Structure 1
Amino acid sequence: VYAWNRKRISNCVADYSVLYNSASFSTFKCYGVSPTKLNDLCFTNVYAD
Protein backbone atom coordinates (compact mmCIF):
# COMPACT_ATOMS: atom_id res chain seq x y z
CA VAL A 1 0.00 0.00 0.00
CA TYR A 2 2.97 2.42 0.48
CA ALA A 3 4.32 1.83 -3.10
CA TRP A 4 1.72 0.11 -5.39
CA ASN A 5 2.11 -0.43 -9.17
CA ARG A 6 0.09 1.89 -11.52
CA LYS A 7 -2.36 1.18 -14.39
CA ARG A 8 -5.18 2.51 -16.61
CA ILE A 9 -7.65 0.97 -19.12
CA SER A 10 -7.33 1.19 -22.96
CA ASN A 11 -10.93 1.19 -24.36
CA CYS A 12 -11.40 -2.37 -22.94
CA VAL A 13 -14.76 -4.14 -22.28
CA ALA A 14 -15.54 -3.24 -18.62
CA ASP A 15 -17.93 -6.09 -17.56
CA TYR A 16 -18.00 -4.57 -14.01
CA SER A 17 -20.83 -6.90 -12.75
CA VAL A 18 -17.98 -9.42 -12.07
CA LEU A 19 -17.32 -7.55 -8.74
CA TYR A 20 -20.72 -8.89 -7.48
CA ASN A 21 -20.57 -12.21 -9.45
CA SER A 22 -17.07 -13.47 -8.39
CA ALA A 23 -16.84 -15.23 -4.98
CA SER A 24 -13.39 -13.81 -3.95
CA PHE A 25 -14.63 -10.31 -2.84
CA SER A 26 -14.08 -9.35 0.86
CA THR A 27 -14.14 -5.48 0.82
CA PHE A 28 -15.93 -2.80 -1.28
CA LYS A 29 -16.49 0.93 -1.95
CA CYS A 30 -19.13 3.05 -3.73
CA TYR A 31 -20.13 6.54 -4.93
CA GLY A 32 -23.03 5.49 -7.28
CA VAL A 33 -25.07 2.43 -8.46
CA SER A 34 -24.06 -1.28 -7.99
CA PRO A 35 -21.35 -3.14 -10.06
CA THR A 36 -23.87 -4.29 -12.75
CA LYS A 37 -24.73 -0.57 -13.31
CA LEU A 38 -20.93 0.05 -13.63
CA ASN A 39 -21.10 -2.55 -16.47
CA ASP A 40 -23.79 -0.19 -17.98
CA LEU A 41 -21.36 2.81 -18.11
CA CYS A 42 -18.29 4.38 -19.82
CA PHE A 43 -15.71 7.18 -19.18
CA THR A 44 -12.99 9.08 -21.13
CA ASN A 45 -10.58 8.43 -18.19
CA VAL A 46 -10.01 4.98 -16.61
CA TYR A 47 -7.26 5.01 -13.94
CA ALA A 48 -7.20 1.37 -12.77
CA ASP A 49 -5.72 -1.15 -10.29
Structure 2
Amino acid sequence: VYAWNRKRISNCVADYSVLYNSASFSTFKCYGVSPTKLNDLCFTNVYAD
Protein backbone atom coordinates (compact mmCIF):
# COMPACT_ATOMS: atom_id res chain seq x y z
CA VAL A 1 0.00 0.00 0.00
CA TYR A 2 3.01 2.42 0.25
CA ALA A 3 3.71 1.69 -3.49
CA TRP A 4 0.31 0.58 -4.91
CA ASN A 5 0.04 -0.91 -8.46
CA ARG A 6 -1.86 0.83 -11.35
CA LYS A 7 -3.81 -0.81 -14.26
CA ARG A 8 -5.15 1.35 -17.20
CA ILE A 9 -8.58 0.93 -18.89
CA SER A 10 -9.21 2.98 -22.12
CA ASN A 11 -11.10 2.97 -25.49
CA CYS A 12 -14.01 0.66 -24.39
CA VAL A 13 -17.59 0.46 -22.89
CA ALA A 14 -18.81 -1.22 -19.63
CA ASP A 15 -21.49 -2.14 -17.09
CA TYR A 16 -20.32 -0.85 -13.67
CA SER A 17 -23.41 -2.03 -11.68
CA VAL A 18 -21.71 -5.45 -11.23
CA LEU A 19 -19.30 -3.72 -8.74
CA TYR A 20 -22.15 -3.70 -6.13
CA ASN A 21 -24.63 -6.27 -7.61
CA SER A 22 -21.89 -8.99 -7.45
CA ALA A 23 -21.68 -10.99 -4.17
CA SER A 24 -17.81 -10.84 -4.58
CA PHE A 25 -17.46 -7.29 -3.08
CA SER A 26 -17.85 -6.77 0.72
CA THR A 27 -18.03 -2.91 0.48
CA PHE A 28 -18.52 -0.37 -2.35
CA LYS A 29 -18.27 3.50 -2.37
CA CYS A 30 -18.17 6.31 -4.99
CA TYR A 31 -16.79 9.88 -4.64
CA GLY A 32 -17.86 12.68 -7.07
CA VAL A 33 -19.97 9.97 -8.91
CA SER A 34 -23.26 8.05 -8.20
CA PRO A 35 -23.33 4.16 -8.26
CA THR A 36 -26.20 3.99 -10.84
CA LYS A 37 -24.94 7.00 -12.90
CA LEU A 38 -21.66 5.13 -13.68
CA ASN A 39 -23.63 3.22 -16.39
CA ASP A 40 -24.52 6.57 -18.16
CA LEU A 41 -21.18 8.44 -17.59
CA CYS A 42 -17.96 8.74 -19.66
CA PHE A 43 -14.24 9.32 -18.81
CA THR A 44 -10.95 10.10 -20.69
CA ASN A 45 -9.18 7.18 -18.89
CA VAL A 46 -9.88 4.82 -15.96
CA TYR A 47 -6.97 3.90 -13.62
CA ALA A 48 -7.30 1.08 -11.04
CA ASP A 49 -5.05 1.73 -7.98
TM-score class, shorter-chain normalisation, is: 0.5 to 0.7
Moved over 6 A (4+): none
- TM-score, normalised via structure 1 length: 0.65
> TM-score, normalized by length of structure 2?
0.65
Q: Structure 1 vs Structure 2: percent identity of aligned residues?
A: 100
RMSD: 2.0
Q: Which runs of 5+ in 2 are unaligned?
A: none
- The count of aligned residue pairs is 49
Structure 1 unpaired stretches of 5+: none
Q: Point out the structure with the larger strand share.
A: 2
